[PDB]
């Protein structure tokens, strides 16, 4: 529309696509940032290409070319606000410091209005949305009230709620949960308005989750419980959903998936994951406040119950359930260790859980079947296994599990050609 650079930018997307440095998007923007800074900040032009018609006589953009523009656009937003190169290409002067302020004002004021339009046009695209939700972090959230633009905040929260209810992708839900935490930044002005919008979204899914579990106690009844719970889990990670009673139906989903084994693997992974955040959130309130002794006991009982469920899930037939239950055990045993009392927090003696040798054996036994065994998926699985070994290596270094059996076993498996060599050499040294 207005901006002439529509031809320049439409071909920068092309120069980035047809040169196949697909993982150098943030690198490409930083490269041409010293010379082509003014072109890359024309976000008015970029939004016009995505939102406006290409006018008769011109050819429209392809689905992929529109995804590349968004990816390049968000990198320009990052480089402008942060005023430093991205991760991979690691002070400001006076003029540079002033330009950073104006750039934050320009990008905020532009995208306060246009971001809900972008989200609305491309709501059914998981890849694009996950990139579009990376923008609010760089906003100056005072302008929502300085400019009296609260009318557009509701449009954004309305579109965020629209993205959540029609998407189950793990990456999309991650972006939504992080955005709602940024809009609740507790800074000053908009803290109140976002909370009402947040509680509305949680309430509408706590009901659609609790009432969906009562129907599961069918192929369609399964998808109802999974979709409604996966969303709650991503939000429970970043937001204190303790006021809601989410542990209740999460435990019941596990206590009957263990007794009967009729539960599907993915529902168990989310139910286990959701309950982990609930316990961690309950611990933050107990830690920050001046609690009573009853509070420690009810949390002591809740933590003990979940740890038992995680041990039983180690014997599940499905590998993802086995994998998920292992990582939660390593994290909880580290959080609820003797280090938990360190820092003058002696009033947490009951909450300390030390693993018995029966459980320490099961953890070491899990490393034997899923870490030490005999192109996009083998590099995918290599990081999957390295994370599991590092989680157990943490327990060894901090004297949470007995080290004498694990140390000798690691020395016998060092025949894995640096696959775990750097991890193993570090854990062996710290003894």
């Amino acid at each position: 529309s207005m901006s002439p650079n529509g031809n320049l930018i439409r071909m920068l997307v092309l120069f980035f696509l047809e040169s196949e440095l697909h993982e150098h998007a943030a690198y490409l923007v930083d490269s041409l940032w010293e010379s082509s800074q003014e072109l890359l900040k024309d976000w008015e032009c970029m939004t016009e290409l995505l939102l406006e018609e290409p006018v008769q006589g011109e050819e429209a953009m392809s689905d992929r070319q529109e995804s590349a523009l968004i990816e390049l656009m968000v990198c320009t937003i990052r480089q402008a606000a942060e005023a430093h190169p991205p991760v991979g290409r690691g002070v400001l002067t006076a003029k540079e410091r002033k330009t950073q302020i104006d750039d934050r004002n320009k990008l905020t004021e532009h995208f306060i209005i246009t971001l809900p339009m972008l989200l609305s046009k491309y709501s059914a695209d998981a890849e694009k949305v996950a990139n579009l939700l990376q923008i609010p972090q760089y906003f100056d959230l005072e302008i929502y009230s300085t400019g009296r633009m609260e009318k557009h905040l509701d449009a954004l929260l309305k579109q965020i709620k629209f993205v959540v209810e029609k998407h189950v992708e793990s990456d999309v839900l991650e972006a939504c949960s992080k955005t709602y935490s940024i809009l609740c930044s507790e800074e000053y002005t908009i803290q109140n308005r976002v909370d009402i919008a947040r509680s509305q979204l949680i309430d509408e899914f706590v009901d659609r989750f609790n009432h969906s579990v009562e129907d599961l106690l069918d192929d369609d009844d399964i998808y109802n419980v999974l979709s409604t719970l996966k969303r709650l889990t991503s939000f429970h990670n970043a937001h204190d959903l303790t006021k809601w009673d989410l542990f209740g139906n999460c435990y019941r989903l596990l206590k009957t998936g263990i007794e009967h084994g009729a539960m599907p693997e993915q529902i168990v992974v989310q139910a286990l994951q959701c309950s982990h955040y609930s316990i961690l959130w309950q611990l933050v309130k107990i830690t920050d406040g001046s609690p009573s002794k009853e509070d420690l006991l009810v949390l002591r009982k809740t933590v003990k119950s979940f740890l038992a469920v995680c041990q039983q899930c180690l014997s599940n037939v499905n590998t993802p359930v086995k994998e998920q239950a292992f990582m939660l055990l390593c994290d909880l045993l580290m959080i609820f260790s003797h280090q938990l009392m360190t820092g003058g927090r002696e009033g947490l003696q009951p909450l300390v859980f030390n693993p018995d040798t029966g459980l320490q054996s099961e953890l070491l036994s899990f490393v034997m079947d899923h870490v030490f065994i005999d192109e996009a998926n083998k590099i995918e699985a290599l990081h999957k296994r390295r994370n599991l070994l590092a989680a157990f290596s943490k327990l060894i270094i901090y004297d949470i599990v007995d080290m004498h059996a694990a140390a000798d076993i690691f020395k016998h498996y060092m025949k894995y050609y640096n696959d775990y060599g750097d991890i193993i050499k570090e854990t062996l040294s710290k003894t």
Partner: peptide
């Protein structure tokens, strides 16, 4: 590399208040 593995939990915690629980047990 391994420094990032031994400094962060196995399950990533998005909220900084939750992540403090795992980091306070380090150093």
């Amino acid at each position: 590399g391994v420094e990032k593995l031994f400094s962060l939990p196995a399950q990533p915690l998005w909220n900084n208040r939750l992540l403090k629980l795992f980091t306070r047990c380090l150093t």
